[PDB]
Design a protein around this ligand. Structure first.
Ligand SMILES: *C(=N)[C@H](C[C@@H]1CCNC1=O)NC(=O)[C@@H]1[C@@H]2[C@H](CN1C(=O)[C@@H](NC(=O)C(F)(F)F)C(C)(C)C)C2(C)C
Ligand SMILES: *C(=N)[C@H](C[C@@H]1CCNC1=O)NC(=O)[C@@H]1[C@@H]2[C@H](CN1C(=O)[C@@H](NC(=O)C(F)(F)F)C(C)(C)C)C2(C)C
Lengths: 306, 306
């Protein structure tokens, strides 16, 4: 038993992390096969951060201007191109530790593990979710750019995030592995701020199911509710509307615990209107929306990865 | 910026995880060099779990009775011995992925990362701390025994825990890598329960320092206090007494933020007596005691590992 914020094993991702240096700027890069992916602001000095012209700055740089280290071995760059906000440095050596990987763009509310890296070396791993304002509540410092977010399916690593910058109130923004920013954010040091963030309702219900599996069933009531009635209360408390797709996704959790999805919605409605009254659910005094239904199933069924 | 429950990268530990099967029981094993470490109840059936005689059961088993798989390759066992509660199966092949490792026994209050594994394959990684009752608030299921807890120092992996069993109220107990149980627990299916657990005071203060580094400074007051006065209030709220060693350990955090340790103790004293009044610290509505001062420094300074 027991429920924790489990992150995916980082072994496969660790073998792909390299250090990319251009001039004086240094940050992390993702080495897959013979292509290294890194944020495009490596070619920027501190003075260029305000109003950078990335296309203009990439003109003045050649292949030898990019310094890539894979541990204690320097990788020879034989080509370079820019796709959106990420650089693709082609190297003469393919990474022998490249796993089966995919480039995916996640939707808001989905979770993934972030491998925080500095100077090409991993510092730690933690799970995170893409909030509805297209930000993440991560932990990044100077030089952490290039750290990637990933999901693992058996032996397949689904890369879905690359850290690029930090927004006010301590939130972070980034791009997919194709360089496209999540949300209306640009890679320049200007006045930017994330929009209002809503609570992922489907993740809250899944987290409540994990509580029932673990024996914490004090919040369950004897009432039921319709989808429309629950959503109207959810709108007041800045909760995302619960679609039929979310209900169908929560099906396996509903079947395992013997509690209908709408019955769990009635219990959640009482919690929103009345609070927890000083009680904790799974040791947390606040409702948790960073656990997808897949995460609950994976954590409570012991799903492993090759 | 940002503060999360960061776990150590699991790449080095993943290469040491193997599956150990004896008869019908299957669990995880740690493969370091030519020795495989696993819990000793692999030689037990479901009927032996009540009152097992591990020495008696190991008599009736030979080297070929132990089935060890390293992925899709079976390892030939050429020797076996029991040290306390862990088996040492000697194999003909040394693990090529064995990193620089140490066997350490941690003290209560110290944190470490747990790599939850099933059938020799990793399921996830999460940080945890040894509570003062010698238990951990982990997440384990059937077959999770043999999962190890570890700490990483540069390139050195300090193994400090091996999961063995689950106690009531969803807490878990285990041994070091030498087979010695943490606390007064035995590896048999009998009536056992953990003692009263206290809140690790030094970890709470370190977590408060991380809040100050991240800008959350609403809880800071203008008062100071002595060590004795703070401890007396701490005893009432089931908080561990703050020794001088804890104060000296919190030194780097005190110097970085410009706040004296005793000044932070006065702020903590107010929080214990008055509560948070509906406010959150680092997004948490409850005080967190699972972050050692080293964890705060490592997280806030970006300490990496080879
Ligand atoms: C990459 N190594 C850093 C890591 C940042 C810095 C501290 N926490 C992080 O995640 N990324 C940056 O320096 C990016 C980058 C320039 C500026 N930047 C920022 O994160 C800045 N914030 C913004 O630009 C904002 F808030 F408007 F989005 C900073 C002032 C440093 C927080 C570029 C090229 C956009
Ligand atoms: C190893 N794979 C399992 C994993 C357990 C089971 C569910 N969560 C876990 O951590 N470990 C065990 O089955 C151990 C083991 C026998 C029984 N056991 C227990 O955890 C039992 N609890 C106790 O014995 C208690 F509470 F008294 F400490 C159980 C009833 C399964 C929770 C042996 C050989 C001690």
């Amino acid at each position: 038993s027991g429920f924790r914020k489990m992150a995916f094993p980082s072994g496969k991702v660790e073998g792909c992390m390299v250090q990319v240096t251009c001039g004086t700027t240094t940050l992390n890069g993702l080495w897959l096969d013979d292509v290294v992916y890194c944020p495009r602001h490596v070619i920027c000095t501190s003075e260029d951060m305000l109003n950078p012209n990335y296309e203009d700055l990439l003109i003045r740089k050649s292949n030898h201007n990019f310094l890539v280290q894979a541990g204690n071995v320097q990788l020879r760059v034989i080509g370079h191109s820019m796709q959106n906000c990420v650089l693709k440095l082609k190297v003469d050596t393919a990474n022998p530790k490249t796993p089966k990987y995919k480039f995916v763009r996640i939707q808001p509310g989905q979770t993934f593990s972030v491998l925080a890296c500095y100077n090409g070396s991993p510092s730690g791993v933690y799970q995170c979710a893409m909030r509805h304002n297209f930000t993440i509540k991560g932990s990044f410092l100077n030089g952490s750019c290039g750290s990637v977010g990933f999901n693992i399916d058996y032996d397949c690593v689904s890369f879905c995030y690359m850290h690029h910058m930090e927004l006010p109130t301590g939130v972070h923004a980034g791009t997919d592995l194709e360089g496209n920013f999540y949300g209306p954010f640009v890679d320049r040091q200007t006045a930017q701020a994330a929009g209002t963030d809503t609570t992922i309702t489907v993740n809250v219900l899944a987290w409540l199911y994990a509580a029932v599996i673990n024996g914490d069933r004090w919040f369950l009531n004897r009432f039921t509710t319709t989808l429309n009635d629950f959503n109207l209360v959810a709108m007041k408390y800045n909760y995302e509307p619960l679609t039929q797709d979310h209900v169908d996704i929560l099906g396996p959790l509903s079947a395992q615990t013997g509690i209908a999805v709408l019955d769990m919605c009635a219990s959640l409605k009482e919690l929103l209107q009345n609070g927890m009254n000083g009680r904790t659910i799974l040791g947390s005094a606040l409702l948790e929306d960073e656990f997808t239904p897949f995460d609950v199933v994976r954590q409570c069924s012991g799903v492993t990865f090759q």
